Amino acid sequence: GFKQDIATIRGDLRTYAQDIFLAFLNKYPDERRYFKNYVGKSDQELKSMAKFGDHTEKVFNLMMEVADRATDCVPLASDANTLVQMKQHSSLTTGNFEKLFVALVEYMRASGQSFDSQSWDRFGKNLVSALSSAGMK
Ligand code: HEM
Ligand SMILES: O=[N+]([O-])c1ccc(O)cc1
Numbered sequence: 001g002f003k004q005d006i007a008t009i010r011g012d013l014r015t016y017a018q019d020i021f022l023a024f025l026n027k028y029p030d031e032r033r034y035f036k037n038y039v040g041k042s043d044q045e046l047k048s049m050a051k052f053g054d055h056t057e058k059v060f061n062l063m064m065e066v067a068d069r070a071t072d073c074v075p076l077a078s079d080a081n082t083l084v085q086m087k088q089h090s091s092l093t094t095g096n097f098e099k100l101f102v103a104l105v106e107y108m109r110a111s112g113q114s115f116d117s118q119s120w121d122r123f124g125k126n127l128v129s130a131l132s133s134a135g136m137k
Pocket of ligand 2: 056
């Protein structure tokens with residue numbers, strides 16, 4: 001289930017982080033805008049860049065901490081608040097997050113693997129709702 005999926009992702013965090021983020025950027029290419037140093041680079045080119053891997057790992061690390069502190073896929077209001085208040089997120093809406101979680105849920109379905117995709121779908125919805133509540137537009 002959802003706890004096991006956190007263990008699976010954490011187990012190979014850099015590979016899942018890159019694979020899922022790239023699925024996100026390729027599914028929603030206008031999102032590439034917020035990431036000026038990833039513009040005009042192939043998946044392969046990006047996976048060779050230390051800093052691409054480092055930033056995606058830090059994002060998915062924090063995402064896995066928020067997932068782990070959640071109860072029945074409902075995140076803490078304080079985790080939501082952390083995500084709205086970070087300077088790096090100051091020009092984002094809930095739609096940016098929605099799209100990430102649509103990409104994460106589609107990756108999992110398309111994976112060979114028994115991910116609890118419906119739980120990640122629900123976690124994404126709950127987090128987008130909590131982010132709104134904490135004042136993100
Ligand atoms: C659960 C979802 C997300 C989490 C946990 C998260 C977490 C983080 C973290 C930890 C950083 C700092 C990275 C570092 O210093 O290396 C960061 C930066 C950033 N995040 Fe997010 N983020 C999320 C979603 C998004 C989304 C959906 C967008 C845009 C569509 C976004 C845009 C950015 C940008 C532009 C930065 C700064 C530049 C960069 O580090 O690449 N984030 N985020
Ligand atoms: O998935 N994301 O939103 C990300 C991914 C990588 C990054 O450096 C910043 C944000």
